Design a protein around this ligand. Structure first.
Ligand SMILES: C[S@](=O)C[C@H](C(=O)O)N1C(=O)[C@@H](NC(=O)CCC[C@H](N)C(=O)O)[C@H]1S
Ligand SMILES: [Fe+2]
Length: 328
């Protein structure tokens, strides 16, 4: 299988005030977005080793009792309000992956969207502090650290598209973003259950089938175990692992907004019998954010797509994905 072109882009100018340097970053983002659709963000400023250590400590110490107590509705009918946030359980013998999802820490019981019980907004659930000292605080701070990186990246994408740098970022705000963190555990298992292994039409053993992301962009930390593949005209290609960088790609909202100038790349997860982490941040806008679709290939910038609200986009997409590839 050939290796995918995934360049490493030094994104540090996007945090500063050197506008020319920022355009040179934007060109690299443009190039990667028009090629395979992936790049690694390097010099991003985030302590990923500490993220992976705190995440390991949580995954390896949470107990079965705690998983039920935090479980989303799909696993625990008592928890009707938890569609998105909480624990996603494994099924020994059938489903290997397990994960924990949390949303904007500002979605508190007094937040006006929580009061209105607006879809896709939830108050996060957390384990007991004494059993997981430091974990909630760590995870909440991680949310804001990756939010800051994501805001810088959105400035780069906006420049790359010929827009002013706050074109996306002005819709990405601490008080209302629908962005989520997922702390995914892919375990080592001996024997590994065949029912937990899917098989692609080409024969490749998979843990998660082909999909486009439900996001504006995805900002991903993973361990140094190769597993991702991207579909290109060349066929599926392997994305090399880099546990020092953030793997970045566009989701299908970006594809809508840009009339597919920046495609949401189709990708999938190969089956690997290895204990590893996958820690995506899904960059979602606010529930009522609307960006007028455009097309940077057309002289007048005009597109024949209708405007779509982020909240409608997100609620439909999350359901569709579960229907396509199954409840994670
Ligand atoms: C790089 S790979 O595609 C990332 C990863 C994986 O399996 O490692 N994936 C997931 O997990 C899949 N994504 C989802 O199921 C969407 C989760 C959305 C989330 N529960 C939310 O409420 O925001 C996909 S995006
Ligand atoms: Fe994905």
């Amino acid at each position: 299988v050939s290796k995918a072109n995934v360049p490493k882009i030094d994104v540090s100018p996007l945090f500063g005030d050197d506008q020319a340097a920022k355009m040179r970053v934007a060109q690299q983002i443009d190039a990667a977005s028009r090629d395979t659709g992936f790049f690694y963000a390097v010099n991003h400023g985030i302590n990923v080793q500490r993220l992976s250590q705190k995440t390991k400590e949580f995954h390896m110490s949470i107990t079965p009792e705690e998983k039920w107590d935090l479980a989303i509705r799909a696993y625990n009918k008592e928890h009707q309000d938890q569609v998105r946030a909480g624990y996603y359980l494994s099924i020994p013998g059938k489903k290997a992956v397990e994960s924990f999802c949390y949303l904007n820490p500002n979605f508190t019981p007094d937040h006006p969207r929580i009061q209105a019980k607006t879809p896709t907004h939830e108050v996060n659930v957390w384990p007991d502090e004494t059993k997981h000292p430091g974990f909630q605080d760590f995870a909440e701070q991680y949310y804001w650290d990756v939010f800051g990186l994501s805001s810088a990246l959105l400035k780069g994408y906006a420049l790359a598209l010929g827009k002013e740098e706050n074109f996306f970022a002005r819709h990405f705000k601490p008080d209302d973003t629908l962005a989520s963190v997922v702390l995914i555990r892919y375990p080592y298992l001996d024997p590994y259950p065949e029912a937990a292994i899917k098989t692609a039409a080409d024969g490749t053993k998979l843990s998660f089938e082909w999909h486009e992301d439900v996001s504006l962009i995805t900002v991903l930390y993973q361990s140094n175990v190769q597993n991702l593949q991207v579909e290109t005209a060349a066929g599926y290609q392997d994305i090399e692992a880099d546990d020092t960088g953030y793997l970045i790609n566009c989701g299908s909202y970006m594809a809508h907004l840009t009339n597919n100038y920046y495609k949401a790349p189709i990708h999938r997860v190969k089956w690997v019998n290895a204990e590893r982490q996958s820690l995506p941040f899904f960059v979602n806008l606010g529930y009522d954010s609307v960006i007028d679709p455009f097309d940077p290939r057309e002289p007048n910038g005009k597109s024949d797509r209708e405007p779509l609200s982020y909240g409608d986009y997100l609620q439909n997409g999350l359901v569709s994905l579960i229907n396509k590839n199954g409840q994670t």
